[PDB]
């Protein structure tokens, strides 16, 4: 749970290859293979979601998720 | 020429890091004090810093006297002894030596034939896996002329030019240890002693109930899907009773991990109260 703390680095999931390994094309520019950790969902990742990585390893850590009409029939 | 422990005094180390880290990104260099022994325990006592022009990749000692004006200023207290070696720092790059390091190290050894270099890498040196290492150069002259005794212990499998170059000219790489005594470990751990107030502070409740009838809400949804997850489970194979259900949030554990927890932190909240009651 320690490394899951700061200072992380962002990325962008692309696709899996195994029960415990996926890939990323981060914002830094390049593409890296990387292993997800357990204690973590899987159901919520396959698209180009948003993610968070561990800097030096370039590992993976945890997930992160996120006009006004005013009228009425009277 | 093996089995050479290198004990270090804990007063020495943390000074090596602090000045070894405060100068980051630009690297940094100081000295070691200690004393050789017959062959094995080349201990260390205390360190200090020569002034210097530090870069991210290079540095020298500017002044050639602040190390000499200070030993002569130390023996008035005599809190240490003579010199035994010198360290330096590679801030994010790994632990090894370079062609500059040897040229200066090659002076110390011929000056005194057991002196030692030390290398440190504070950036990747996390609260766990420190990576410090030390080195004694060889005589490649003695090599082309062409040692273990019943124990060797530890070798590295990384730091490439400490792993394929780390022998042919670098050094008879050599382990380290720590002289953590009782007289100091007592004064060492005196941080984490919380306080004599720090075991009867019945903190506010306005999160407690907001956790209690919040937690049970988080129990059911994993329970009643574990209620689903026992439907028959004898389906199409013994492995099909296992591998059709990946470990994506295995439910029964997940409730037990909180079952015990909410029990374990509430039982203290109730007990602590009745004890605090008899403060009066």
From Swiss-Prot, chain A:
The chain holds residues 87 to 172 of 428 of the full protein. It is found in: Cytoplasm; Nucleus. Signal peptide: none annotated. The 26S proteasome is involved in the ATP-dependent degradation of ubiquitinated proteins. The regulatory (or ATPase) complex confers ATP dependency and substrate specificity to the 26S complex. Belongs to the AAA ATPase family. This is 26S proteasome regulatory subunit 6B homolog. The lineage of its organism: Eukaryota, Fungi, Dikarya, Ascomycota, Saccharomycotina. The gene is RPT3. N-acetylated by NAT3. It comes from Saccharomyces cerevisiae (strain ATCC 204508 / S288c).
From Swiss-Prot, chain B:
The keyword Cytoplasm does not apply. Zn(2+) binds at residues 88, 90, 101. One of its GO terms (cellular component) is proteasome complex. Its EC number is 3.4.19.12. GO terms for molecular function: cysteine-type deubiquitinase activity; metal ion binding; metal-dependent deubiquitinase activity; metallopeptidase activity; proteasome binding. Keywords: Acetylation, Hydrolase, Metal-binding, Metalloprotease, Protease, Proteasome, Thiol protease, Ubl conjugation pathway, Zinc. SMART domains: JAB_MPN (SM00232). Residues 6-141 form the MPN domain. A motif (JAMM motif) lies at residues 88-101. It holds the Pfam family RPN11_C. N-acetylated by NAT3. Component of the lid subcomplex of the 19S proteasome regulatory particle complex (also named PA700 complex). The 26S proteasome consists of a 20S proteasome core and two 19S regulatory subunits. Interacts directly with RPN8 and STS1. PANTHER family: EUKARYOTIC TRANSLATION INITIATION FACTOR 3 -RELATED. The JAMM motif is required for the deubiquitination and degradation of ubiquitinated substrates. Belongs to the peptidase M67A family. Present with 16400 molecules/cell in log phase SD medium. Component of the lid subcomplex of the 26S proteasome, a multiprotein complex involved in the ATP-dependent degradation of ubiquitinated proteins. RPN11 is the only catalytically active member of the lid and serves as the essential deubiquitinase of the proteasome. This is Ubiquitin carboxyl-terminal hydrolase RPN11. It comes from Saccharomyces cerevisiae (strain ATCC 204508 / S288c). The gene is RPN11.
